[PDB]
Amino acid sequence: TIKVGINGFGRIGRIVFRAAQKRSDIEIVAINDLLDADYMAYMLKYDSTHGRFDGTVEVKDGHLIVNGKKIRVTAERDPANLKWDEVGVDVVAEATGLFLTDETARKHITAGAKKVVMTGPSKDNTPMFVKGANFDKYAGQDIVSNASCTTNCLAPLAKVINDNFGIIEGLMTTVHATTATQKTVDGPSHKDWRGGRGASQNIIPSSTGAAKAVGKVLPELNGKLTGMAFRVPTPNVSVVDLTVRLEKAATYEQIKAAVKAAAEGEMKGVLGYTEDDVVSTDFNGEVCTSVFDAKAGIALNDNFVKLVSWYDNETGYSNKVLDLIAHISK
Amino acid sequence: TIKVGINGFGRIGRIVFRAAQKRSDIEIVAINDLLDADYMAYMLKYDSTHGRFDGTVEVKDGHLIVNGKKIRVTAERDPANLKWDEVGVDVVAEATGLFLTDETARKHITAGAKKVVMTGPSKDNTPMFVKGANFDKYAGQDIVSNASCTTNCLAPLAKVINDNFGIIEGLMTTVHATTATQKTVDGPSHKDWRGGRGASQNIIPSSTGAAKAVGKVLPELNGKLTGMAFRVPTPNVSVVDLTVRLEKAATYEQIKAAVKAAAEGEMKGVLGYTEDDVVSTDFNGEVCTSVFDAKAGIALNDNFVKLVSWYDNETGYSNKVLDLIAHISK
């Protein structure tokens, strides 16, 4: 199995840790964060969004024992001190959102680590990989990025719609759930004023680089996409609203049939399809990084349409983070 | 097994149906309400609070096929027409809220059923029974009420404390979650002006017969308790705050010990005990109708203390609704 050491036990670090327990190829052997071992166990035991941990966890010797296995608990501010090799960490899940550049992220490899996977879009040119889109483009790089939860939702569906009718151009909107970066009441958000406003009281316009980033994972789409976000008061689960102009004419019945196909075949597990009357909570715990909502989407005509696809911005992304870890290791 | 027929597919009815599945002594055979089998299936398949139905459901000739078994569906306004014997129903779960009296519930019997269990406090003298409080007081009555969620949470804890230190008197407050009777925005509520104001916008003071009802379920407490509610903006899970005066002085440490005793002792399954830093969501899906929160309680002195216990007003209550069906079938 692959030895993984997570850096940052936030929303992502914790959900990837939970999802890893159900896999046979991966082993989490260490956690680093400025969290006491007993606090780390509490944050893992109870989750407001996903329920109590389906497993056992105990504190011992300053470390944790989860489901019978010992996990190294550290509190290193400087990653280049983590001595990952000592527990045998193969790939480090860089989930602090703080070291999204090769220079910073490499401090992990300097620290006895083999490879590192950013759990967020890189700030430098570090390559991002989205499952169902550009995984087969991996070139043995030791540092990569799993992109963002949104790109993980857009790229897959974009690819299918593109390869089938050609996307002339498109504008994406993501009605996204509240995240740890926001405030409970109007607070300071220097780099983004709207972002510091009361999260539960507002619909907050926000900017995302996920539409553009898709032109990076699916080069054929370079320059054909851009968009924005609206942060709304929900704790988890978001949705993309993709407005596209189609090269090849196509009826809505045809667009569905092609998404469903990719869903049942080539894209199985990454892209999903449904014709039920779903709402956001119906996707809390969703592993498919992109679920196409047939009845929600609408077409003005055969070359201009709006498509809707759901995504548990926590669960899906967290699983695909693990798939990329497996991937670059294989 | 015991044959159950649900009347009213609302929150209590739908969660009763669900919990009923993992049982064995009971079997749901029919469901009545004013919805189409396909709408009934949809409501059952997706729950915003408890997740997707863990099983199989589809429609077969205007009926439902859940987990492979056929569930009789009907949409009758008059209970006396349900012809419950055609499906050999033993007990009826009266979950409409419209038939909490003898002459209204009895219609079920007149329809071919054996006994009825109101899933709410009776409007008349019909006997209420709460697990862990007065089940042994059951005397073959054919129509009974399971009281309410709040009563099912308070009665068990009240009994233990009284039985142990003697309650001279107490006042209770339940910080309760929003329910189907409330409004999304300020709306009509002819018999309760506050209960009509936007649920998600306010902390809404409200009346509860709970406390007093404990005086009926636990006759030794008649006139010793009373209380109110504060409806807050959460979708499920409530908590009782009980301020009481004790006869025999007792330290918290001792109150803890006595409750933990009942917990694994006589009250197992009904009364729970935890010393963890829990919040409401951690009990979403809780079966025990009263989980004592050790750390949250406060004592001014050995004869004046405030005790808090959690309860999932949907899940816990519903489970006990089935426990009383089995009980009254002995």
XYZ file of C-alpha atoms in Angstrom:
660
model
C 0.000 0.000 0.000
C 0.918 3.675 -0.457
C 2.023 5.524 2.685
C 0.365 8.936 2.913
C 1.050 11.688 5.396
C -1.447 14.530 5.491
C -0.385 18.102 6.139
C -3.301 20.147 7.445
C -6.229 18.474 9.194
C -8.870 20.897 7.963
C -12.066 20.065 6.098
C -10.135 18.388 3.258
C -7.458 16.706 5.307
C -10.121 15.173 7.504
C -12.438 13.946 4.754
C -9.587 12.491 2.691
C -8.516 10.735 5.888
C -12.013 9.323 6.388
C -12.363 8.204 2.782
C -8.897 6.596 2.834
C -10.047 4.152 5.518
C -12.272 2.429 2.955
C -9.393 1.828 0.524
C -6.881 -1.014 0.411
C -4.118 0.637 -1.596
C -3.598 3.591 0.700
C -2.390 3.899 4.278
C -2.418 7.128 6.276
C 0.547 6.955 8.654
C 0.942 10.547 9.777
C -0.814 13.815 10.360
C 0.806 17.164 10.854
C -0.988 20.246 12.130
C -0.957 22.545 15.129
C -3.525 20.271 16.781
C -3.117 18.258 19.969
C -3.536 14.514 19.410
C -6.668 14.485 21.581
C -8.143 17.393 19.607
C -7.387 15.716 16.255
C -9.344 12.631 17.439
C -12.337 14.748 18.463
C -12.426 16.603 15.122
C -12.314 13.206 13.397
C -14.825 11.481 15.675
C -17.585 14.033 15.137
C -18.514 15.827 11.952
C -21.431 18.249 11.664
C -21.847 17.413 7.954
C -20.956 13.721 7.615
C -21.917 12.195 10.961
C -19.770 10.334 13.453
C -16.644 8.496 12.309
C -17.393 4.945 11.194
C -14.432 3.524 13.072
C -12.386 3.488 16.233
C -9.848 6.070 17.271
C -7.891 6.505 20.483
C -5.070 8.708 21.790
C -1.868 7.115 23.067
C 1.620 8.464 23.690
C 0.717 11.745 22.018
C -0.271 9.835 18.887
C -3.459 8.308 17.613
C -4.503 4.755 16.994
C -7.234 4.654 14.384
C -8.834 1.334 13.604
C -5.930 -0.497 15.213
C -3.167 1.392 13.387
C -0.829 4.040 14.819
C -0.755 7.429 13.140
C 2.082 9.912 13.616
C 0.783 13.190 15.025
C 3.080 16.210 14.581
C 2.857 19.980 14.999
C 5.450 21.252 12.527
C 5.107 24.799 11.226
C 7.940 24.252 8.746
C 7.174 21.292 6.419
C 10.895 20.870 5.738
C 11.146 19.540 9.295
C 8.510 16.823 9.066
C 10.954 13.934 8.521
C 8.296 12.038 6.540
C 10.713 9.239 5.611
C 10.805 8.205 9.257
C 7.224 6.855 9.029
C 7.835 6.013 5.392
C 5.439 8.500 3.851
C 5.384 7.981 0.067
C 3.008 10.762 -0.989
C 2.101 13.766 1.165
C -1.387 15.280 0.890
C -0.588 19.012 1.081
C -3.920 20.221 2.498
C -3.011 23.455 4.296
C -3.763 25.669 1.319
C -0.535 27.346 2.394
C 2.063 25.683 0.153
C 0.506 25.650 -3.292
C 3.759 26.308 -5.147
C 6.659 24.043 -6.034
C 9.103 26.063 -3.901
C 6.974 25.695 -0.776
C 5.557 22.257 -1.558
C 9.023 20.794 -2.261
C 9.956 21.342 1.408
C 8.029 18.085 1.839
C 10.355 16.101 -0.410
C 13.320 17.774 1.283
C 11.686 16.220 4.345
C 12.118 12.594 3.277
C 8.933 12.633 1.191
C 8.665 10.981 -2.233
C 5.871 12.924 -3.990
C 3.401 15.631 -2.956
C -0.209 16.284 -4.075
C -1.656 19.761 -3.571
C -5.310 19.540 -2.530
C -6.041 22.836 -4.284
C -5.158 24.702 -7.513
C -1.470 25.528 -7.606
C -0.435 29.183 -7.364
C 2.531 28.543 -9.702
C 2.563 26.480 -12.906
C 2.552 23.170 -10.988
C 0.380 20.793 -13.043
C -3.181 20.045 -11.993
C -4.922 16.777 -12.815
C -8.649 16.072 -12.815
C -9.965 12.516 -13.036
C -12.087 11.950 -16.132
C -10.208 14.692 -17.974
C -6.396 14.785 -18.033
C -5.124 11.985 -15.791
C -3.382 10.232 -18.680
C -1.234 13.345 -19.093
C 0.740 12.658 -15.911
C 4.487 12.598 -16.654
C 5.988 11.305 -13.420
C 6.217 14.779 -11.879
C 6.951 14.563 -8.132
C 4.679 17.523 -7.331
C 1.154 17.868 -8.705
C -2.193 19.461 -7.858
C -5.681 17.956 -7.800
C -7.015 21.375 -8.912
C -10.216 22.484 -7.150
C -13.621 20.972 -6.307
C -15.246 23.114 -8.984
C -12.830 22.217 -11.806
C -13.334 18.613 -10.780
C -17.015 19.159 -11.538
C -16.718 21.254 -14.718
C -13.890 19.577 -16.657
C -15.544 16.103 -16.804
C -18.851 17.412 -18.114
C -17.058 19.919 -20.311
C -15.011 17.146 -21.912
C -18.118 15.107 -22.739
C -20.037 18.061 -24.163
C -16.992 19.208 -26.107
C -15.993 15.849 -27.625
C -19.631 15.466 -28.640
C -20.773 18.797 -30.033
C -17.834 21.120 -29.752
C -17.989 23.943 -27.267
C -17.681 27.230 -29.149
C -17.558 29.259 -25.939
C -19.004 29.051 -22.436
C -19.736 30.946 -19.245
C -19.971 29.037 -15.946
C -21.620 29.990 -12.669
C -21.151 27.951 -9.503
C -23.691 28.303 -6.682
C -21.213 27.147 -4.065
C -21.620 26.078 -0.454
C -20.062 27.903 2.495
C -16.414 27.103 3.218
C -14.019 27.496 6.149
C -12.621 30.694 4.561
C -15.808 32.683 5.200
C -17.198 34.435 8.310
C -20.167 33.747 10.615
C -20.851 37.503 10.807
C -19.443 40.449 8.830
C -15.705 40.121 9.415
C -12.323 41.103 7.925
C -11.409 39.608 4.558
C -8.706 41.980 3.276
C -8.157 40.253 -0.071
C -11.871 39.821 -0.726
C -14.358 42.176 0.888
C -17.520 40.326 -0.096
C -15.998 37.154 1.352
C -15.939 38.457 4.905
C -19.664 39.240 5.018
C -22.036 37.133 7.129
C -22.063 33.729 5.433
C -25.532 32.591 6.522
C -27.172 35.946 5.830
C -26.014 36.411 2.241
C -25.772 35.247 -1.329
C -22.175 36.395 -1.876
C -20.762 37.006 -5.370
C -17.317 35.429 -5.540
C -14.597 34.829 -8.097
C -13.318 31.458 -9.226
C -10.536 30.440 -11.585
C -12.132 27.071 -12.217
C -13.623 27.892 -15.612
C -10.255 29.134 -16.899
C -8.390 26.293 -15.133
C -10.449 23.805 -17.174
C -8.774 25.194 -20.284
C -5.583 23.993 -18.606
C -6.639 20.385 -17.918
C -8.406 20.122 -21.298
C -6.120 22.295 -23.515
C -8.576 22.026 -26.397
C -10.798 24.283 -24.308
C -8.178 26.949 -23.625
C -9.737 30.419 -23.797
C -13.299 29.114 -24.400
C -14.404 29.241 -20.749
C -14.601 31.635 -17.804
C -17.038 32.238 -14.963
C -17.884 33.147 -11.409
C -19.444 32.025 -8.160
C -22.220 32.806 -5.727
C -21.536 31.638 -2.176
C -24.785 30.637 -0.473
C -25.743 29.557 3.093
C -25.431 25.751 2.964
C -22.709 23.796 4.777
C -21.782 21.416 1.973
C -22.597 20.465 -1.627
C -22.406 22.864 -4.568
C -23.605 22.975 -8.215
C -22.386 24.271 -11.581
C -24.565 26.144 -14.039
C -22.835 25.936 -17.454
C -24.137 28.080 -20.302
C -22.669 26.910 -23.616
C -22.805 27.635 -27.330
C -22.522 24.435 -29.376
C -20.685 23.959 -32.659
C -22.691 20.855 -33.675
C -26.489 21.189 -33.327
C -28.016 18.901 -30.696
C -31.368 18.395 -29.008
C -31.612 18.043 -25.237
C -32.455 14.350 -25.616
C -29.153 13.906 -27.438
C -27.155 15.888 -24.877
C -28.487 13.710 -22.062
C -27.936 10.430 -23.907
C -24.293 11.425 -24.394
C -23.724 12.407 -20.779
C -25.473 9.275 -19.533
C -23.275 7.246 -21.868
C -20.032 8.721 -20.559
C -21.494 8.197 -17.083
C -22.200 4.519 -17.684
C -18.936 3.971 -19.471
C -15.693 5.853 -19.982
C -16.485 8.291 -17.154
C -18.087 5.882 -14.656
C -17.320 6.904 -11.085
C -16.282 10.465 -11.952
C -19.306 11.680 -13.913
C -22.813 10.790 -12.817
C -26.256 11.066 -14.325
C -29.797 11.415 -12.983
C -33.329 12.388 -13.984
C -34.752 12.580 -10.456
C -36.058 15.702 -8.671
C -32.929 16.209 -6.575
C -31.841 19.083 -4.351
C -28.418 19.744 -2.843
C -28.617 17.549 0.270
C -29.247 14.533 -1.979
C -25.550 14.736 -2.810
C -23.996 15.038 0.661
C -21.514 12.151 0.594
C -21.410 12.001 -3.215
C -18.235 10.367 -4.602
C -18.850 11.196 -8.282
C -17.116 14.548 -8.729
C -19.863 15.640 -11.119
C -23.496 14.589 -11.255
C -25.441 15.730 -14.283
C -28.995 16.914 -13.427
C -31.124 16.182 -16.504
C -34.376 17.884 -15.527
C -32.732 21.024 -14.118
C -30.929 22.011 -17.318
C -32.585 23.996 -20.107
C -32.056 24.723 -23.776
C -33.027 27.852 -25.710
C -32.265 26.016 -28.965
C -29.950 23.341 -30.441
C -26.721 25.402 -30.205
C -27.338 27.310 -26.974
C -28.018 25.591 -23.636
C -27.660 25.546 -19.848
C -26.504 22.409 -18.059
C -26.540 21.694 -14.322
C -24.196 19.292 -12.481
C -23.948 18.674 -8.728
C -20.901 18.145 -6.577
C -20.255 17.446 -2.901
C -17.330 19.884 -2.787
C -15.931 17.847 0.107
C -16.541 14.148 -0.530
C -16.046 13.913 -4.286
C -12.912 16.047 -4.310
C -11.471 14.225 -1.290
C -11.844 10.863 -3.025
C -10.336 12.041 -6.320
C -7.436 13.414 -4.283
C -6.818 9.785 -3.266
C -7.252 8.571 -6.840
C -4.512 10.960 -7.946
C -2.299 9.706 -5.118
C -2.864 6.165 -6.311
C -2.325 7.299 -9.892
C 1.006 9.069 -9.603
C 2.243 6.175 -7.449
C 1.266 3.427 -9.898
C -44.302 -10.459 12.945
C -46.698 -7.614 13.746
C -48.456 -6.033 10.765
C -48.281 -2.248 10.691
C -50.158 0.224 8.525
C -49.122 3.876 8.513
C -51.690 6.648 8.334
C -49.898 9.859 7.452
C -46.645 9.909 5.517
C -45.248 13.079 7.099
C -41.924 13.378 8.938
C -42.938 10.952 11.687
C -44.619 8.571 9.257
C -41.693 8.459 6.829
C -39.010 8.048 9.523
C -41.167 5.401 11.230
C -41.289 3.504 7.935
C -37.509 3.757 7.684
C -36.526 2.665 11.191
C -39.141 -0.093 10.869
C -37.025 -1.683 8.116
C -34.057 -2.650 10.294
C -36.454 -4.313 12.748
C -37.825 -7.867 12.684
C -40.832 -8.207 14.976
C -42.755 -5.637 12.883
C -43.569 -5.305 9.186
C -45.087 -2.286 7.402
C -47.839 -3.495 5.057
C -49.790 -0.403 4.040
C -49.525 3.407 3.898
C -52.373 5.903 3.562
C -52.213 9.633 2.785
C -53.045 11.949 -0.072
C -50.030 11.449 -2.296
C -49.445 9.256 -5.325
C -47.403 6.105 -4.940
C -44.713 7.724 -7.111
C -44.645 10.870 -4.963
C -44.609 8.677 -1.812
C -41.593 6.824 -3.244
C -39.816 10.089 -3.981
C -40.371 11.355 -0.411
C -38.992 8.050 0.867
C -35.971 7.920 -1.491
C -34.543 11.325 -0.626
C -34.442 12.880 2.819
C -32.748 16.221 3.304
C -32.055 15.352 6.944
C -31.364 11.602 7.014
C -29.871 10.722 3.597
C -31.123 8.559 0.748
C -33.281 5.576 1.681
C -30.997 2.628 2.329
C -32.878 0.051 0.289
C -35.029 -0.451 -2.783
C -38.192 1.319 -3.802
C -40.153 1.375 -7.046
C -43.816 1.554 -8.049
C -45.761 -1.525 -9.074
C -49.342 -0.917 -10.113
C -49.994 2.153 -7.988
C -48.269 0.453 -5.071
C -44.775 0.458 -3.693
C -42.159 -2.227 -3.785
C -39.767 -1.347 -0.985
C -36.894 -3.736 -0.259
C -38.686 -6.258 -2.446
C -41.912 -6.274 -0.416
C -45.258 -4.848 -1.535
C -46.647 -1.921 0.418
C -50.339 -1.187 0.020
C -50.916 2.446 -0.921
C -54.236 4.294 -0.514
C -55.389 7.927 -0.334
C -58.454 7.948 1.878
C -59.628 10.971 3.835
C -61.879 8.894 6.099
C -59.994 6.362 8.280
C -63.080 4.131 8.621
C -62.739 3.292 4.910
C -59.160 2.001 4.962
C -60.263 -1.663 5.159
C -57.123 -2.451 7.159
C -57.985 -6.159 7.540
C -57.666 -6.778 3.786
C -53.924 -6.358 4.494
C -54.125 -8.049 7.892
C -52.813 -4.992 9.759
C -52.337 -5.477 13.509
C -51.547 -1.951 14.622
C -51.955 1.462 13.014
C -49.506 4.354 13.376
C -51.820 7.353 13.434
C -49.373 9.982 12.180
C -51.676 12.599 10.628
C -52.051 14.741 13.729
C -55.739 14.954 12.929
C -56.900 11.942 14.939
C -55.607 12.314 18.502
C -58.851 11.383 20.242
C -60.723 8.109 20.744
C -63.606 8.607 18.298
C -61.171 9.660 15.592
C -58.541 6.963 16.072
C -61.072 4.161 16.694
C -62.160 4.642 13.070
C -59.027 2.624 12.300
C -60.285 -0.250 14.460
C -63.685 0.058 12.798
C -61.682 -0.269 9.550
C -60.346 -3.662 10.606
C -57.252 -2.857 12.674
C -56.675 -4.184 16.204
C -55.120 -1.242 18.058
C -53.914 2.304 17.337
C -50.854 4.247 18.530
C -51.113 8.014 18.068
C -47.752 9.443 17.046
C -48.474 12.521 19.150
C -50.205 13.644 22.386
C -53.883 12.750 22.477
C -56.400 15.576 22.396
C -58.469 13.673 24.962
C -57.807 11.333 27.894
C -56.343 8.575 25.710
C -53.378 7.038 27.656
C -49.904 8.178 26.719
C -47.021 5.764 27.265
C -43.319 6.633 27.223
C -40.550 4.017 27.105
C -38.465 4.116 30.273
C -41.281 5.801 32.171
C -44.556 3.878 32.161
C -44.610 1.042 29.652
C -45.254 -1.463 32.437
C -48.372 0.612 33.102
C -49.889 -0.634 29.864
C -53.127 -2.506 30.479
C -54.333 -3.877 27.161
C -55.838 -0.572 25.986
C -56.669 -0.666 22.249
C -55.881 2.987 21.492
C -52.816 4.764 22.908
C -50.481 7.725 22.334
C -46.662 7.700 22.364
C -46.777 11.236 23.805
C -44.260 13.549 22.156
C -40.544 13.824 21.366
C -39.972 16.306 24.195
C -41.888 14.187 26.692
C -40.013 11.102 25.543
C -36.807 12.980 26.299
C -37.766 14.470 29.656
C -39.770 11.649 31.273
C -36.853 9.157 31.309
C -34.386 11.644 32.839
C -36.992 13.020 35.274
C -37.790 9.540 36.581
C -34.162 8.645 37.212
C -33.424 11.889 39.065
C -36.660 11.771 41.060
C -36.280 8.063 41.831
C -32.786 8.906 43.046
C -32.821 12.287 44.743
C -36.438 13.352 44.750
C -37.537 16.316 42.693
C -39.277 18.893 44.840
C -39.957 20.942 41.725
C -38.412 21.830 38.383
C -38.841 24.095 35.362
C -37.874 22.948 31.852
C -36.930 24.605 28.589
C -36.441 22.726 25.335
C -34.366 24.388 22.623
C -36.194 22.650 19.813
C -35.605 22.387 16.065
C -37.905 23.796 13.377
C -40.782 21.538 12.305
C -43.329 21.235 9.528
C -45.836 23.442 11.370
C -43.575 26.504 11.253
C -43.148 28.909 8.320
C -40.250 29.728 5.957
C -41.149 33.456 6.044
C -43.642 35.359 8.269
C -46.960 33.619 7.552
C -50.430 32.549 8.854
C -50.705 30.838 12.258
C -54.178 31.680 13.607
C -53.642 29.790 16.917
C -49.988 30.766 17.456
C -48.748 34.098 16.194
C -45.081 33.524 17.066
C -45.054 30.107 15.437
C -45.864 31.734 12.092
C -42.805 33.997 11.918
C -39.877 33.049 9.691
C -38.403 29.888 11.189
C -34.860 30.376 9.878
C -34.878 34.038 10.924
C -35.851 33.777 14.597
C -35.493 32.255 18.065
C -39.211 31.649 18.619
C -40.594 31.249 22.141
C -43.315 28.593 22.259
C -45.694 26.531 24.393
C -45.124 22.848 25.097
C -47.354 20.502 27.071
C -44.282 18.339 27.608
C -43.330 19.074 31.219
C -46.923 18.736 32.449
C -47.368 15.529 30.418
C -44.517 14.053 32.496
C -46.920 14.652 35.374
C -49.300 12.287 33.607
C -46.762 9.670 32.508
C -44.922 9.967 35.841
C -47.852 10.585 38.230
C -45.468 11.073 41.176
C -44.450 14.328 39.485
C -47.931 15.676 38.825
C -47.712 19.407 39.509
C -43.946 19.405 40.141
C -42.849 20.399 36.609
C -43.730 22.804 33.833
C -41.942 24.464 30.930
C -41.712 26.082 27.521
C -39.809 25.934 24.254
C -37.580 28.046 22.032
C -37.850 26.999 18.398
C -34.489 27.692 16.779
C -33.215 27.459 13.155
C -31.989 23.839 12.874
C -33.701 21.171 10.702
C -33.657 18.374 13.307
C -32.415 17.483 16.802
C -33.573 19.234 19.969
C -32.363 19.474 23.605
C -34.027 19.827 27.012
C -32.739 22.164 29.697
C -34.096 21.081 33.085
C -33.708 23.187 36.216
C -34.713 21.256 39.333
C -34.581 21.260 43.121
C -33.653 17.978 44.748
C -34.661 16.486 48.081
C -31.543 14.479 48.884
C -28.456 16.592 48.333
C -26.332 15.145 45.549
C -23.124 16.281 43.883
C -22.911 16.500 40.128
C -20.460 13.650 40.234
C -23.270 11.691 41.921
C -25.953 12.818 39.515
C -23.656 11.739 36.696
C -23.130 8.321 38.244
C -26.860 7.750 38.750
C -27.722 8.707 35.178
C -24.909 6.642 33.724
C -26.285 3.853 35.876
C -29.779 3.970 34.423
C -28.171 4.349 30.997
C -26.442 0.942 30.947
C -28.825 -0.323 33.600
C -32.613 -0.251 33.428
C -32.857 2.559 30.871
C -30.497 1.065 28.275
C -31.585 2.051 24.765
C -33.846 4.820 26.059
C -31.426 6.888 28.130
C -27.910 7.644 26.930
C -24.882 9.201 28.608
C -21.847 10.999 27.219
C -19.049 13.122 28.633
C -17.964 14.389 25.196
C -18.087 17.924 23.783
C -21.117 17.248 21.593
C -23.362 19.576 19.580
C -26.819 18.994 18.138
C -25.818 17.388 14.809
C -23.957 14.605 16.636
C -27.371 13.283 17.563
C -28.955 13.481 14.165
C -30.051 9.873 13.811
C -29.921 9.107 17.541
C -32.196 6.245 18.659
C -32.056 6.767 22.448
C -34.801 9.315 23.177
C -32.751 11.064 25.896
C -28.982 11.427 25.936
C -27.654 13.083 29.075
C -24.842 15.592 28.384
C -22.582 15.440 31.438
C -20.274 18.349 30.588
C -23.090 20.773 29.663
C -24.938 20.505 32.963
C -24.400 22.988 35.780
C -25.101 22.927 39.495
C -25.434 25.913 41.796
C -25.472 23.597 44.847
C -26.355 20.020 45.855
C -30.111 20.793 45.699
C -30.281 23.121 42.697
C -28.998 21.867 39.358
C -29.521 22.296 35.612
C -29.431 19.174 33.482
C -29.314 18.922 29.672
C -30.205 15.886 27.532
C -30.330 15.569 23.729
C -32.966 14.011 21.516
C -33.465 13.636 17.779
C -37.114 14.699 17.702
C -37.646 12.580 14.553
C -35.486 9.481 14.852
C -35.683 8.762 18.594
C -39.406 9.335 18.841
C -40.095 7.203 15.761
C -38.061 4.257 17.052
C -40.009 4.360 20.299
C -43.231 4.551 18.335
C -42.383 1.053 17.059
C -41.296 -0.103 20.501
C -44.771 0.741 21.801
C -46.413 -1.120 18.938
C -44.480 -4.220 19.891
C -45.152 -3.531 23.555
C -48.918 -3.200 23.199
C -48.938 -6.375 21.096
C -47.566 -8.537 23.919
